[PDB]
Each structure stands twice: as structure tokens, then as C-alpha cells.
Amino acid sequence: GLFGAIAGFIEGGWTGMIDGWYGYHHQNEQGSGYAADQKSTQNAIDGITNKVNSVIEKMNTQFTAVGKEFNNLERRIENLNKKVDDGFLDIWTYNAELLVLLENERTLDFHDSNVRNLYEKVKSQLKNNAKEIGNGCFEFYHKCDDACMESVRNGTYDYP
Amino acid sequence: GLFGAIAGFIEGGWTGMIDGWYGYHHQNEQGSGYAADQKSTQNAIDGITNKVNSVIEKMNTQFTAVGKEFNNLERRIENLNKKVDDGFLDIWTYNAELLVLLENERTLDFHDSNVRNLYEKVKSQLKNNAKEIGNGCFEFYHKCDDACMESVRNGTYDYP
Amino acid sequence: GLFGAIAGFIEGGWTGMIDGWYGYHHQNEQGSGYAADQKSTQNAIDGITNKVNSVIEKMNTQFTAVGKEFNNLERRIENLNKKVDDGFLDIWTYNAELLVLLENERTLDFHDSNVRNLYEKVKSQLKNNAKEIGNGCFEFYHKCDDACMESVRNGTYDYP
Amino acid sequence: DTICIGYHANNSTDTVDTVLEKNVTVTHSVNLLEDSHNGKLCKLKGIAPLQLGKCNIAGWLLGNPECDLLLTASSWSYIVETSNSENGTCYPGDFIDYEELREQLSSVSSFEKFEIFPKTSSWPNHETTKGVTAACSYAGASSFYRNLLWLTKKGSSYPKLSKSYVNNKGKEVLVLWGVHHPPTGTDQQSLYQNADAYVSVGSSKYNRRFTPEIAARPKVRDQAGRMNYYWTLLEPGDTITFEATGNLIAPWYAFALNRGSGSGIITSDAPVHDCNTKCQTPHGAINSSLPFQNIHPVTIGECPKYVRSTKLRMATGLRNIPAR
Amino acid sequence: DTICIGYHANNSTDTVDTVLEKNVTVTHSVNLLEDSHNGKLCKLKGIAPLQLGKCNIAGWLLGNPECDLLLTASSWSYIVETSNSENGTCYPGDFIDYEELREQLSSVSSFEKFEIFPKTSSWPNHETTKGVTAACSYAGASSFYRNLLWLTKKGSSYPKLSKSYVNNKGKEVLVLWGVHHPPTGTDQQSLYQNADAYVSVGSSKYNRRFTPEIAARPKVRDQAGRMNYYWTLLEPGDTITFEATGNLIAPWYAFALNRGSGSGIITSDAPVHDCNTKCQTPHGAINSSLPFQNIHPVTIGECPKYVRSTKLRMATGLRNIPAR
Amino acid sequence: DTICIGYHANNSTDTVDTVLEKNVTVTHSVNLLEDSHNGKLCKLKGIAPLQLGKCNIAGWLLGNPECDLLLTASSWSYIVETSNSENGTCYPGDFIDYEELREQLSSVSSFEKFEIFPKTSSWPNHETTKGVTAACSYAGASSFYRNLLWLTKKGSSYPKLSKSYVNNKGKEVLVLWGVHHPPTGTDQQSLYQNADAYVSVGSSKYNRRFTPEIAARPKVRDQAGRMNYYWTLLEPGDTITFEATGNLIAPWYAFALNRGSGSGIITSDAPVHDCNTKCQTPHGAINSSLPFQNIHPVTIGECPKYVRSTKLRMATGLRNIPAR
Numbered sequence A, B, C: 001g002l003f004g005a006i007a008g009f010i011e012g013g014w015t016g017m018i019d020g021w022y023g024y025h026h027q028n029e030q031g032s033g034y035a036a037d038q039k040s041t042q043n044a045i046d047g048i049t050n051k052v053n054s055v056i057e058k059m060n061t062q063f064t065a066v067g068k069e070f071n072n073l074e075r076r077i078e079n080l081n082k083k084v085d086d087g088f089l090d091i092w093t094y095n096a097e098l099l100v101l102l103e104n105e106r107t108l109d110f111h112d113s114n115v116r117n118l119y120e121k122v123k124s125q126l127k128n129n130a131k132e133i134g135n136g137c138f139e140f141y142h143k144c145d146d147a148c149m150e151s152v153r154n155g156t157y158d159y160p
Numbered sequence D, E, F: 001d002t003i004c005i006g007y008h009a010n011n012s013t014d015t016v017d018t019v020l021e022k023n024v025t026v027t028h029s030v031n032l033l034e035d036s037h038n039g040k041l042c043k044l045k046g047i048a049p050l051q052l053g054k055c056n057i058a059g060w061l062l063g064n065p066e067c068d069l070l071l072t073a074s075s076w077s078y079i080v081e082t083s084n085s086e087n088g089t090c091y092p093g094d095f096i097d098y099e100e101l102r103e104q105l106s107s108v109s110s111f112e113k114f115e116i117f118p119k120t121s122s123w124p125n126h127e128t129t130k131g132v133t134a135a136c137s138y139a140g141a142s143s144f145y146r147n148l149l150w151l152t153k154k155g156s157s158y159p160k161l162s163k164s165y166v167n168n169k170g171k172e173v174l175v176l177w178g179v180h181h182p183p184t185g186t187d188q189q190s191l192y193q194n195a196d197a198y199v200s201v202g203s204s205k206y207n208r209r210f211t212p213e214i215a216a217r218p219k220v221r222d223q224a225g226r227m228n229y230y231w232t233l234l235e236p237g238d239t240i241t242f243e244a245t246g247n248l249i250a251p252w253y254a255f256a257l258n259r260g261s262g263s264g265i266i267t268s269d270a271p272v273h274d275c276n277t278k279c280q281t282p283h284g285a286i287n288s289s290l291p292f293q294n295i296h297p298v299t300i301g302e303c304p305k306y307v308r309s310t311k312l313r314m315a316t317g318l319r320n321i322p323a324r
């Protein structure tokens, strides 16, 4: 991962969480659970959606295109027409395949960055009130409840 | 922001600072103010400038290009010529529009990265002598003067 | 550096280390030395190799392509053929030059990211048992031997 | 008490490629490549295509005997030839600028067939009937094209004919005609009398004169003789004027053309059905909103961009790590 | 005491687009798309263009009556036709390989007009004057082309003429001529006498022979007769040789051509002015250093790349967040 | 005790470019641009090319005297003309559809030359010998093409000849022939007798008739006369049939063609050697596995993509910072 988060310091994904792409776990007395962050997940969605629409836009749809015929004394011209058709075909194929290849790389890194950014958005909130363990989990010092967990997965919290 | 800085952990910009793109604030007894970092700002400028020149280079200027005429028995040839002209036109338009779209994304992220890098260049200097608050501001412990602020926005400082 | 590591907070490279691209130094009683990290270096290699092969794949090799001849009354057709040949040539040249330019930028940043990620993979292991100095070096508190250094450049270590 | 930051994941098995790594499984993705089709030749905007079946453009327009089915047609969305469209020029010869005629037809959406020179009316002094051959037989007997008339001497009396037509249709008129080239000087006699006759067509932009080139040529469909076919588009107002003294296969029926765009000629052996589509190809009709397709470069309507790719999948979700 | 790290920002309202988001306001940016122009046909490198106004390439070169203004021209930067450039071939007929002639002219920057075959000198035994028609009238009376001479029988005496010319100019010589086709055999008599005459032009690379094709054709500008125009480029040293016995509209004036590059023919109704530019288009002249333009695909000089884009703005500064 | 994290570095001096910065030194990189070559015209898949040297396609096929070396050739990998390939049509005239013939030859890998119409056998009643000119001299004396036969009247007795040939080779047969055009009516007499003769070639798809066009034309190689050359590909089974009464330069030798792909004609003055390659260009042979080359756009075999670039270096290693 270009950003070290996904398949990185956060080893794997939660087949459990199904509200979005990025979220929180939480293990308070009252019980456990999973909760996706709308803020994050919605932005990623809007972006990706915009990307896919932009890629389809640049590719104008093709209109009528039928062949042409040539007599046995129009060989040069016949081949010129052949050269043109094949040439354009090579280029479009190249453009289409490459754009996808390049943009795929960019998309995966986008997510990696998004995940890493959320982590450090939480980490800067807690600070002392908890300690960094592993797999991007924090361990509370002042043991907080469900009413508190909601101030974390919200940005409110407050307690330097 | 791919790097979480701009429009990220540093919520907004300073309509005040007008010496460059990236700089420092500073609030010492002697008074406040704004000061852009030449080091940073000049590099970003050199890069961006180089980018814009490179994009314009790949687009060779167009020389004379006039139409051609065909009689009422040269329809196939007339359309072949038409197919060629339109084909090249589609491709260039696609290339131009896409390069700009893709490079714009890259430019905005460049700045975001530049900002984030400056922050951590300062943060590693101070360390204990100040504490991280919010919006990328540090609060001094050993309260320093204007003569000291200039060792910060310089890289000198020194005081583990 | 987009990731602030190479030619960044780690000022320069080790002309010494010759086992890979990324590695460790280490200065234990028993003596000094250099050691590249296979894990890192091998992945970067596999990626870069895959990239270069992918770029060469999209460029199908050119087969037979000879000129054509036209009599002094086939000028329009002669120029149409001329326009086609030059047109395709401009595009391929543009595509080739641009792909390399853009991918080069991406490669250098890849390495920068790789280096930065290794640093923070080590930093999260040590923690208290050592302190961050400069140029990405850590100074041990519990002074460890060669048998221990191998638990660092391995990920084992263990000692919160 | 703890809290963890993580990312979605699932059972998805879809894979995409990247410049750095191949076959990476992701949580979500979209396909951009259309590769499925109808398998049938459909209608475009309500109108159905025009099958020529055993006939080709030449047969159809000229009126070859076997192409009587087509006689009633007047409008289509696109013309269709097949692997056995060999019924055209039944009497050996040449069709001058045939390819250019086809190119013209590609922008014609409909026409009005009309007897320009009535068989029994425009030809006194000259004998209409008895202008048939075995080369273009019908039911077993000999015959000829339904749009062209073979004028032969009326009792060793082939006077100098001169007929004309004025284009009063507000459209373009397609006029077709031919010129015969008998094998032996003897036949020239028995057909148009005059040993050295000539044919001369002319209008405002058209002007050309023909002369019989009698000779000895191999037999084609039991014929050592030949016949060249010609055509031209008569403009609105202009007048075309034939003037011959023998050998003139005369214009009997002509067409007033309606220029439409986005039409064309295609070769396909796919079945025609009562199906409507927005995109047709020789392999069948396509119904997709995807940006590309790898079905066929030949297209009619509004289709995806043809491409040689086998796979085009774009990632949307993230790297899928189940780690179950 | 504190210190903060931040980034510039301002009142800028310029917006750019990205693959992930549209309409993002930035602090600084540059436009790469030129869309403004002169509105006038200017000079390129000092030299001005050549207006044909009511005339077309055919008229100009042939010498049609109405195109006397052009008679004095010798050099230009580019040729200009308009929406009413219909004064060319005044006497009905065909201009063989006309399009190819235009293509040739596109690489000609200047020439020297010269009477190749002096009217009163090169034509004894044959009568020069009295070769005019109403089709090409002037001031009200009948007339003819200023570069071509209509030779008619000198008192029922049309001997076999044979004139020649040697290219001693060090350049290429453009030779134009015609061939007349009277409507009735009667007229052939009254014009060149000999019932069956012929015309034969020839040089080193050129060789062709013409024969009158008398017939009946509709009236065009009150004419049932026709006249075909021809041309060829005579190489340095070679010799062209006409030999006719009637029907030869003879070469009176020819041109020695100067090949220049980057010139061409364009169609525009934009006013010509005393303005100099480096890039001209049918809509007007352009003066930019931007890489692209969406004004017109037709170009003369050194211009930006034509493109269909509406907007091409490239960010340079950063995301502009005033947060005032 | 300490430990540091760092990255490789070395003495490498290779530099690459990026969009943000130029000339950056990296530790490792690869060149993608091939710019070196053989300097010689080599063999492709064992077979060697066919040099025409002082001859051109016309000379070779027609059998021009000076091109006797080529007489023995039958197979090649690609045809080669040079800067002095001017030995072709020795007797002035025209080679109808010459360019199209060359295009045809570009897909011919080998053929079988065979006397289609034996000089002493197929021509009684007509005189074979004495059909030579100074225009096509040899050793000093006058001569003619080795594949074409010049038939002249056998003692003021030029009967109407009619010869035919059937294509029984299973391949395509290339038939070449000519038509003479004497300068003065007097010569027509002395050569083929009959004042007004004619030539008529014909087959299944071919049909054309020629007539002498006697006149006065400048001297070329001391000749005011002309000679037009013709050709056509006779299909398997079909029959070609000549029928003339004078002026027919007859077919003596023909070729059965073998269609191969990926061959072609090129112009080069590079030396031919006993060298084998997979990629040949007019400048020399190339041997690379790189994706691009900037040597020459003309190619034969399997080569890199031609491009105008001067440099194409792709980084693999990282920014090289020795900091020694």
C-alpha cells in the first residue's frame, strides 16, 4: 500500500462491517459491534462515482460506420483505407486499456489514503486518554461507554 | 486531501499570507504576523512551472492545413478523407482533455503533500519544547521571541 | 519527495549498502554494518518489473510497412496518404514520450513511499525502548546486541 | 475498553489489473466492455431493413428477374446483402462506377419508383417487345430486366430516336441504362440494322457518347456478347436526353431519392426479426450503455466504441482481504 | 507563545476540474484554450492574400471577363474564394482534373503571366478575331476569355495548323486550352469548315488526342454546345506541341510558376484588411501563444492545435479556501 | 547502540525526466529506444532480397536489355531499387496503371517465368525477327525486350492474327504487352502495312480495344514514336485472347505468381550481405527487443515502433544521492 494502511499496518478487512468501506469496531462493557463512518465512506463514493462518469464521458459513442468497396484496380486506395481503419483501432484499444490500468492503481491508493487519514483523525483526538496497540486499535485509559464511543466516531470527544 | 493536510487537519487557508503558498503564523509577545517559507514555495513554483512547460511542449503547434475537393464520382475517397480528419480530431481532443483532468488531480495533491511535509519538518524540530494543539499550531513551553521564531522558520532552532 | 523520506528527512543514500534498495545500518558493540531488507526490496523489484513489462506490452511491435507511389495526377490522394502517415506518427510519439514522463514521476514516488513505510514499521516496534534522533536513526535505551538487531530487521523484537 | 479503525471486505471474487500487479481481487468494480448481442437483424426506429437475399445492389436496382420480391420496397433503415447475393447482372458486361453507386445508396433512406419512359407509348417507330435473352431467363423462358427496355429494329427500320425527360419531382432522380456490344458484325445487322450506330446521353452536368465495340470474347452464361450498364443522378429541373441509333438498352423505370443519414449497406447472414434496437451490427443487435464493445467494427445506429480488448474492468471498491 | 503552519488563499474564483471532483476553486491557474480572433483576413509575412471575390479558380486562370481585376496579380500568401465565387466557366463544358489543378495551386506562391502564343503573330492562315459568344458577354456585347483564343476558319479555309513552344523560363509553365463541341453538324461547317477535324496536344510526358462529339444537349446559358478545358505543367526544357484542324480553343497566355510552401486556398466572407498575422483562419486571424484553439480546423501559418474542447484550464495554485 | 533506516545509492550517472523536474540521476533504469543498426541489406528467414541495381520494376518485368542479370531470379524476401534504377522503359511511352502493378508485386514472394507465346511457333504468316530499335540497344547494336515480341508485316502481308492462352497453372498469370504508335502515316505502312489496323485484348474480366494514334511528338532517345505498355492478372481457368492487325507488341514470356505476405519494395543504396535478420530497414537491419526505434519508418519483418523521439529512458531504481 502506497500509504501503508490497507493490507499494511491494518493487516486485513472486516467481512462484518457492511455500512460502508471505512468504519470503527469498538468494545465497551455494554458490548461490541461495527459502525461505518458516513463522512468518509460517502466522500469516497462521490469521488469514485465522479471518476467513473468522467472516464465514460471522454469516450464518445460510435455512430454509423460501414465498409467501402474497391475494384481490382483500386488496390492502393483500398489499402490506404485499410491502413486508416486499423490505425485508429490500435490507438483506441491502447487508450482504453491504459486508462483503466492507470486509474485502477490510483483507485486502490485512494482507499489506502482514506483509511490512513481516518486513523490519524482519531489518534489526534484521543492522545493520552488511550494507547496505540496494533492493527490500528486504541486502548482506552479512562474506559468509556457507548455514549462516549459516539463522540469518537463523530469527532466530538474532547479531553487532551 | 490525499495527504490529509490541506482542507484537512489544517481546516482552512490564510487570506492574509501573500508571500507564497506555504508559511508560518507566529504569536510572540512582540506581536503577531505571517511569513511564507521561501524554501517550500520556491520549489513548488519551480515544479509547477516545469510541469506547465512540459505539457505545452508535447503539443506541437499546427501548421498549414486546408481542405481538399472531390468531384461527384469521388465519394468514397471524399469520405475516407472525412474519416481521417474526424478521427484525428477525436483523439487530440480526448488527449488534451484527459491530460488536464489527470494532471489537475496531481497538482492539488502535490500542494497537500508539500504542506504536510513542512508541518512535520517543524514538528521534528520542536519536540518537547512545545505541544501540538490543533490546526497545525504548536504551543511553546519555553516561550520564545522573534529572534527565536526565525530559527524555527529557518531550521536552525536546536533544543531537543 | 512526495512522501518526505528520500532526499527528505533521510538526507542521503548509502553508497555502502549493496544488497537492495532499502535496508538498515546498525551500530552494536560487536561492530557496525549494513543490511538490506529482502521483504521490502523484493516487493519493489517485483512491482517495477511488472510495470516495465506492462508498458512494453501495450506497444505492439510494428510489422511490414512500405511506401506507396502516385502519378502526377494523384496529388490529393498522395497527400491524403501523407497526412495519415504523419498523423499516426505524431500520436505514437506523443503517447510514448508522455507515458515515460508520467510513469517516471510515479516510480520515484513509489520508492519514497516504500522507504517511509519501512521507517514507521520499525518505529512502531521500538517505541519507548529507543528514541528518534535524526536521519531516520533510532538510539536504543536498553542497548541490544547483534542477536537483537536481527529481531528488529525482522519484525520480531517484542518489548512495548 | 477499546476502539478500532478498519475497512469493509467481502466474498467478492472479481479481479482487476494494475500497472504494478495483476489479478487483484477487489470488493466492488464495474465492467466497461460489452460483449453480448441479439444474434438478429432488427429494426431501427420502427423501420425494418431491406433484405436482398439472393440479390445484390446491381440486381435490385437493374430489376434482374429473380429479384421480383424487392419490386414493392420503398423505404428501409439499412440495406442487407448475404453470402449468396449473386443475382445481379445476368447478361455479362460492366457496371461503370458501381462502387460509387453503392456509396451513394448508403445515404438514401427511401425512394419512389416510376416508369420514366413507358414501354408502350414512348417507343413508336421502334419495336419494344422481343428484347429478351436466355442469360436472364424466367420460369424457364427467356426474359430481361424489369426497369430497362431492350429496343430492337422494327422490321429492318431503326430510325434515329431521341427521347427526353424533365426532373419535376423536387428530388434527385436515379437514371440507369445500358449499351450492348454484339459479338459479330452480322448480329449488329439483325438487331439494330444500321452497321455503325451510336448512343448519346446528355444533361447539364452529364455528357458522354458511346459506340459499339464488336468483337470475339469467351462465352459467359452462353454469351460472347457484352452489355455495359450506366447511371447518373439527374438534378431538380435539369433534363436528361438520350439519342441513339441502335444498341441502346433504354431506361424504363427510375427512382426519386430521399436522402437520409446514418444508414448504410452491410453483409450478414443473421436472421431478420420483428425486434427494435438502437444499435445494429452484422452479428446481431446490441443493447448496452457500456462505453466499449468487442463485437464488431461495423455499426449502424448509436453504439459503443469498437475495441480489440478482451477485458476492461475498472475497480471502484478496495483491495478485498477476507482474512476469514 | 505559539507558531502555526498554513497555506496561501484568496478571492480568486477560477475553477478547474479533476477526475474525482468537478468545479474546484483554486488560487492560481492558466488557460490553455484560445477562443478569440481577429475577425479579419490578414497578411502573412507582409504579403497580402488574393481575393477572387465573385470569381473562382477556374475564372481567374481561364481569364473569364468579369475577373479583370485579377489580371494584374502576381504574388499572394493564400488564395481566397467566397460564397459568391461563381464566375468561372462562362461557356458550358467540363474542366478535366479541376480539383487536381487546385491542389497544385495550393503550393504556388507567385507566377509570371506571359502571352505564349501572340494573337496577332502566331496565327496567319487562320482567323483570330470573331471568336466570341453571348455566354461570355461583356459590357453588354459578346466576348471571350482573355487567356484563351477561339480560332475559326479564315474564309472557308481552315488549314492544318501546328504551333509549338519551348519552356525557357527555368520554372514550370502552366498551359491551359480547350476543345469545342458544336451541337449540329451544320455548325461544325460554319466554324472550322472541315466536317471531321481533330486536335492533338503533346510533349514529353503528355500525349492525348481529341475529336469533336457533336450532338444535342439542353441549353445552358443559351447554349446546346459545350467546351472542355484542359491543362498541364510543362517541364523546364520540354516542348509542348498543339496540332489541330478545327475546334481548338488555343492557348494565348500561360504562367511560369513559383513553388512556395505553407500556402493554400480557403473559403471565407471575412473582410480583408491591412493587418499582419502569424496565424490565419476563415473566421479571422489569431494571435496567441496558447497550445490549443477551438476557432477553426482550417489553418494557414503557425497556429494552436484545433480541438473540440469548450474549456481547458490547468491548476497551478492550490485549493482556495477563504474561510473568511 | 543504534540502528538506521536508509536506501541504496551509487556511482550511476544515468538521468531520466519527470513532469516536475528534468535531468534526475537515478540508480537504475532501462532504455526503451533503439537507435542502432546493421548498415546492411540482409536476408529475412534465409531468403535473400532481389536487387534491381540499375533497373526498376518496369525494366525487370518487361525484360529491358540491361537487366539480363535478373532473368534468372525466381524468389526473394523483398525487392530493392536504388538511386540509379533508371533502366526500365527504353522505348518511350506510357505504362498504364504502373503504380497499381507495383502494389500488386508487393505481395508476391516468387513466380515461374514461362514463354507463353513461343517466338518461333505461335507466329507464322507473321514475321518474328526484325523487331528492334536503337532506343533499346545492346552491345552496340539495336535490340528489344526479352519478354515482349515486336511483330511486323511479313512481306507487305499482315493478316489478321488471333492467338489465345489458357491459364493452367493453378496460380495467377501476369501477362504484359504493348501497343505501338508510329509518328507518320508512312511508317504505319512500312511496319504493319494496313493503314488502319487495331488491337483487341480480352478475357473474362478484361475487355479493351486499342487504335493507333499517329502524330508528331518531340524526340525521346531519338524517337518521335511512342509505345504504351499494359498488364493484367489472368485468373485460374480463364482465357486471355489477343486479336490484332498491326501495332501489337506481343506477349512472349509471362509469370505465374506466388502470393506471400509481409514482403514489399524499398529504395536503398545500402550493400547487400550474407547476413540474416528479423527486421530490415532502408538504412540497415535491426536486431533489438526494445519497443521503439527512431531509425526509419519503412520496415520489413518484425520491428520496434517507429517514433520521432530522441530519448526514452524509464527509471527503475530511485533518486541517486551519493552524498559521498
Ligand SMILES: CC(=O)N[C@@H]1[C@@H](O)[C@H](O)[C@@H](CO)O[C@@H]1O
Pocket (backbone or CB within 6 Å): A147, A150, A151, A154, A156
Ligand atoms: C453526528 C451527530 O449526530 N452528532 C452527535 C454528537 O454531537 C454527540 O456528541 C454524540 C453523542 O451524544 O451523538 C451524535 O453523534
Ligand SMILES: CC(=O)N[C@@H]1[C@@H](O)[C@H](O)[C@@H](CO)O[C@@H]1O
Pocket (backbone or CB within 6 Å): C150, C151, C154, C155, C156
Ligand atoms: C523471519 C525470521 O528469520 N524469523 C526468526 C524468528 O523466528 C526468531 O524468533 C528470531 C530470533 O530467534 O529470528 C528471526 O526473527
Ligand SMILES: CC(=O)N[C@@H]1[C@@H](O)[C@H](O)[C@@H](CO)O[C@@H]1O
Pocket (backbone or CB within 6 Å): D054, D064, D065, D066, D086, D087, D088, D089, D090, D091, D135, D136, D137
Ligand atoms: C437472372 C439471374 O441473373 N439470376 C441468377 C440465375 O440465373 C442463376 O441460376 C443463379 C445461380 O448462380 O444466380 C442468380 O440467381
Ligand SMILES: CC(=O)N[C@@H]1[C@@H](O)[C@H](O)[C@@H](CO)O[C@@H]1O
Pocket (backbone or CB within 6 Å): none
Ligand atoms: C439456373 C441456371 O441458369 N443455371 C446456372 C448453372 O448453370 C450454374 O452452374 C450455376 C452456378 O454458376 O448458376 C445457375 O444455377
Ligand SMILES: CC(=O)N[C@@H]1[C@@H](O)[C@H](O)[C@@H](CO)O[C@@H]1O
Pocket (backbone or CB within 6 Å): E011
Ligand atoms: C473580487 C475581489 O475580491 N476584489 C479584489 C480586487 O479589488 C483586487 O484588485 C485583487 C488583488 O488585490 O483582489 C481581488 O480581486
Ligand SMILES: CC(=O)N[C@@H]1[C@@H](O)[C@H](O)[C@@H](CO)O[C@@H]1O
Pocket (backbone or CB within 6 Å): E015, E023
Ligand atoms: C463558475 C462556473 O463555471 N459555474 C458553475 C455552474 O455553472 C455550475 O452549476 C456549478 C455546479 O456544477 O459550478 C459552478 O458554479
Ligand SMILES: CC(=O)N[C@@H]1[C@@H](O)[C@H](O)[C@@H](CO)O[C@@H]1O
Pocket (backbone or CB within 6 Å): E064, E065, E066, E086, E087, E088, E089, E090, E135, E136, E137
Ligand atoms: C463573365 C461570366 O462568366 N458571366 C457570369 C455572369 O453572367 C453572372 O451573372 C455571374 C454570376 O451569376 O457569373 C459570371 O460573371
Ligand SMILES: CC(=O)N[C@@H]1[C@@H](O)[C@H](O)[C@@H](CO)O[C@@H]1O
Pocket (backbone or CB within 6 Å): F015, F023
Ligand atoms: C540542455 C539540457 O538538456 N539540460 C541538461 C543540463 O541541465 C544538465 O546539467 C546536463 C547533464 O545532466 O544534461 C543536459 O544538458
Ligand SMILES: CC(=O)N[C@@H]1[C@@H](O)[C@H](O)[C@@H](CO)O[C@@H]1O
Pocket (backbone or CB within 6 Å): F064, F065, F066, F086, F087, F088, F089, F090, F135, F136, F137
Ligand atoms: C537498355 C536500356 O534501356 N538502355 C539504357 C541506357 O542507354 C542508359 O545509359 C541506362 C542508364 O541511363 O539505362 C538503360 O540501361
Ligand SMILES: CC(=O)N[C@@H]1[C@@H](O)[C@H](O)[C@@H](CO)O[C@H]1O
Pocket (backbone or CB within 6 Å): none
Ligand atoms: C443574365 C445572366 O447573365 N444570367 C445569369 C442570371 O440568370 C442571373 O440573374 C445573374 C445574376 O445572378 O447571373 C447570371 O449569370
Ligand SMILES: CC(=O)N[C@@H]1[C@@H](O)[C@H](O)[C@@H](CO)O[C@H]1O
Pocket (backbone or CB within 6 Å): E276, E277, E278, E286, E287
Ligand atoms: C497579430 C497581433 O495583433 N498580435 C500582436 C502583434 O501584432 C504584436 O507585434 C505583438 C507584440 O507584443 O503582440 C501580439 O499580441
